[PDB]
């Protein structure tokens, strides 16, 4: 558990319907939500593969007369043993796989957060609830750049310095 979901981010966004993870930005031209396309797509592909693997990894009934009770009981034992083994396998598989999926989503959110942090460096201040306030006024182009992964630190460094 990476402590991002139900962790630093105390809750989800019901106003965000286009993806699992993403951003909410407030600027002078307006606020809005926008899912992070790369991470959401990668997560969807990984989960699709996970679900397909479980499905893709994966004639009975005999009759005996009154003098073959032993073979009937042997057949019953075979059927019951296979049934119990398969029930146990399915239950354990689901139980562990659900945790791996939830931890994977937590890791995705956490990694998105640290990627934005490492991009911004000291040009932004961590509010602490999960957000960043920019020391420098920067418009929708700035937000699109930081979302994409091509934020230009030296461009805004001087302007952010005297506001810090």
């Amino acid at each position, epitope marked *: 558990l990476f402590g991002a979901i139900a962790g630093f981010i105390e809750g989800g966004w019901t106003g965000m*319907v*286009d*993806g699992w993870y993403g951003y909410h930005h407030q600027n002078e031209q307006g606020s*809005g*939500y926008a*899912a992070d*396309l790369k991470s959401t797509q990668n997560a969807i592909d990984k*989960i*699709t593969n996970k*679900v397909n693997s479980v499905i893709e990894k994966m004639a009975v009934g005999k009759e005996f007369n009154h003098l073959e009770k032993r073979i009937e009981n042997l057949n019953k034992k075979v059927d019951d043993g296979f049934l119990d083994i398969w029930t146990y396998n399915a239950e354990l598989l689901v139980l562990l796989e659900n945790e791996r999926t939830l931890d994977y989503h937590d890791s995705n959110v956490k990694n998105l957060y640290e990627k934005v942090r490492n991009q911004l460096k000291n040009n932004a201040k961590e509010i602490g609830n999960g957000c960043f306030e920019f020391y420098h006024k920067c418009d929708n182009t700035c937000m699109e750049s930081v979302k994409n992964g091509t934020y230009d630190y030296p461009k805004y460094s001087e302007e952010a310095k005297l506001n810090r």
Partner: antibody
Amino acid sequence: KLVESGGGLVQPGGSLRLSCVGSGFGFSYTYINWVRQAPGKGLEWLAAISSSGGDTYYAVSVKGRFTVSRDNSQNTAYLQMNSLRTEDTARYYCATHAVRLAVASFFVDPMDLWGPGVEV
Amino acid sequence: TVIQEPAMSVSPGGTVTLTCAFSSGSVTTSNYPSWFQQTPGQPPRLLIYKTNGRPTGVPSRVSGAISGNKAALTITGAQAEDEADYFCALYKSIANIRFGAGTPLTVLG
């Protein structure tokens, strides 16, 4: 495929229920969108419902007057219109993203499978 | 609101681009443009989803991209079966899908 039903004549102020039934694409894991096209006018998105029916999204011009429901066991999606006006004369379509098994169904999923549509 | 071209015409064998934009704003990849083709009296057919998606059964001639603050649909080498009404669907925020007016494409010849 997607087959629609309902539709016909209605007085201004009446109600009508439309149904959309699908087969072969995992109806329980897809968003269902209801769209309209007025005769001689462009398409107009009307409503959308999630896979479990918890999330329902309407347009501003049809909010309150339209209600959307889903029955996954019968593989049906229902649109009920009350307080029908004169401007609501159009051909109605049900659309969805038809996939074998959707791990994640989102509101912005593409509208691939369209029904023939009904008339109102 | 969504703004499209009132009408455009193309010659056979040539390339044609169709633009879809906002009345006030910029169209980006986060707005998920979707292009629909409707022949009269038929349900619409999806051509492009998410500005580059090509569903199975759609020729590689039809392609999409983002140019400036607009979403662009390019059809290269138009035939006579590429005469229909083209619609643009754009997602704004808080679950609002808006369709365009529709641009009737008239292939000359």
